[PDB]
């Protein structure tokens, strides 16, 4: 039998610029131990927004002005911005509550990038 429950590296709330809403919407992100990243619609975790990998789907990580030619939401800086450059090209624009939150995530990702070859 499988474990049953899985613990996420870091779980928190983050905004995401949708292609249909063309705006920043508060979402729920959650990174897995295997690197895999999955976000939901709300704390309910019932409407699985989507699922994407980091060291597999994401190739580069930009933050702030470095990110695409996007723009931060109202009453929010730019350094708190977090983007994820996918392989093909897909680009996801995210935003943290404050630089602190952003930094944490960014670093967390840059770390999950070292996931693949057996470690032991």
Number of domains in the chain: 1
Q: Return phi, psi of residue 110, to 5°.
A: -50, -20
Tokens of 69: 């030619």
Give yes or no for a contact between 26 and 49, defined as CB atoms under 8 angstroms apart. Answer: no
When computed from its CA atoms, the radius of gyration of the chain, rounded to whole angstroms, is 14
Residue 84's CATH number: 2.30.29.30
Tokens of 35: 């690197």
Give yes or no for a contact between 77 and 104, defined as CB atoms under 8 angstroms apart. Answer: no
| Beta partners for residue 101, in sequence order | none
Question: How many Å apart are CA 43 and CA 67, to the nearest integer?
Answer: 27
**E strands, the chain, in order:** 11-17, 24-31, 37-40, 50-52, 58-62, 81-86, 91-95
Residue 55's domain spans which residues? 1-120
- Give the residue numbers of the binding site: 25
Residue 48, judged by CB atoms within 10 A of its CB (0-12, 13-18, 19+), counts as exposed
What is the sign, positive or negative, of the torsion defined by CA atoms of 101, 106, 107, 108? positive
């Amino acid at each position: 039998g499988s474990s049953g429950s899985s613990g996420f590296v870091k779980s928190g709330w983050l905004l995401r610029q949708s292609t249909i809403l063309k705006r920043w919407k508060k979402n729920w992100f959650d990174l897995w131990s295997d690197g895999h990243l999955i976000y939901y619609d709300d704390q309910t975790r019932q409407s699985i927004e989507d699922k994407v990998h980091m060291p597999v789907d994401c190739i580069n990580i930009r933050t702030g002005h470095e990110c695409r030619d996007i723009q931060p939401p109202d009453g929010k800086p730019r350094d708190c911005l977090l983007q994820i450059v996918c392989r093909d090209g897909k680009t996801i624009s995210l935003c943290a509550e404050s630089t602190d939150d952003c930094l944490a995530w960014k670093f967390t990702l840059q770390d999950s990038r070292t996931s693949g070859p057996s470690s032991g």
